[PDB]
Amino acid sequence: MKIFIVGSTGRVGKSLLKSLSTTDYQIYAGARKVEQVPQYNNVKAVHFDVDWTPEEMAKQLHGMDAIINVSGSGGKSLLKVDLYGAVKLMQAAEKAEVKRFILLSTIFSLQPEKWIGAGFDALKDYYIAKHFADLYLTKETNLDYTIIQPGALTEEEATGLIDINDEVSASNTIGDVADTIKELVMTDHSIGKVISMHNGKTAIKEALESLLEHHHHHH
Amino acid sequence: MKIFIVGSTGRVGKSLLKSLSTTDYQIYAGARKVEQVPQYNNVKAVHFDVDWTPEEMAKQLHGMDAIINVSGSGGKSLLKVDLYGAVKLMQAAEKAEVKRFILLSTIFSLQPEKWIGAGFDALKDYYIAKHFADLYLTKETNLDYTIIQPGALTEEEATGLIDINDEVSASNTIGDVADTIKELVMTDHSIGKVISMHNGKTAIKEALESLLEHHHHHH
């Protein structure tokens, strides 16, 4: 399918482009500076700016089959990028009539009651920004969404092994986060779902398959 | 009635306490440091912290007839105070079963399409924080709310004269903002309404009265 990536030139974005480069998808990598997009045979760089309005953004999203948001500001522009930019992209997706939307968020983003201790204290502003964007996606859109909520991101080599939905905050390699997102594209039962993850013991495909047991589709 | 104030020790809060000091209301002035609350015969200082959870906040709100939020961070803690703190207070009001809620926001807070030019550019982060809190109040609560949206705040002497709902961004004295909020407490037809203001030509009471002409109550 045709997949549009926002956050293409960030660390997770670059890993995701690498991950998607070996698929049959046509990838459209949004970037403020198109020349900064890493080159792959199935990747086309598209001018895209998080500071744009939803209508400006929507111009680039026509005919896409899915949109993946892996855009962050490294904590340096939380209101503009991680919150407002993310929400404007959701508004843009709806304007462009693109239903499938995958958002990279963070462990416990919708559970402020679990923002406990010095680790969450240090990331409080980040948590607030991500929280409100996730509320918007889950409450104020009609998108076929999936929110993936990893723990701390590491640059260690991908293990291929994760565990999910266990209320655990633990680290995960960026490569495994990217590969999980890649698999979520092909996981229709994850539509309307919020999924937490960390590095663990279960192959990514099998881990996501294990969600079929108790997921219910809302007619 | 019994009115709880959040933001009591800030500049607008102190003006609002002065304004309310000459009413028949019983004022409960929330503050992190109770000793910082200016003293008035009808004002009781109550320990209140924006960093608290909704449930912690709700403990202080029992038996209040109205809650007024005039809390800001002077642009220094927008995610924690102007957005998250404001939203937690709304959640607290509902938990405490207090219906009447008046929020100080800002001109065009719900109209991003009017955030035009260098003035709005400089206040973009503030605008984003206020925008999302206003969306929450208007879309994700069942409160009997009023949002007042003044233009730039000045410390000039109150004129008693304003104009409202004219799509104009212009300055207003803090005293006139405080006195408008005071009048809104007694203006039941402003429930469920968003009202913009600046200094102008119309006495505050008369200006608010002029809203009866076309306001509709949603049964």
UniProtKB/TrEMBL annotation, chains A, B:
Membrane spanning residue stretches: none
Domain NAD(P)-binding: 7-185
Pfam families with a match to the protein in the record: NAD_binding_10
CDD domains, per database record: SDR_a5
Protein name: Oxidoreductase
Organism: Lactococcus lactis subsp. lactis (strain IL1403)
Gene for this chain: ylbE
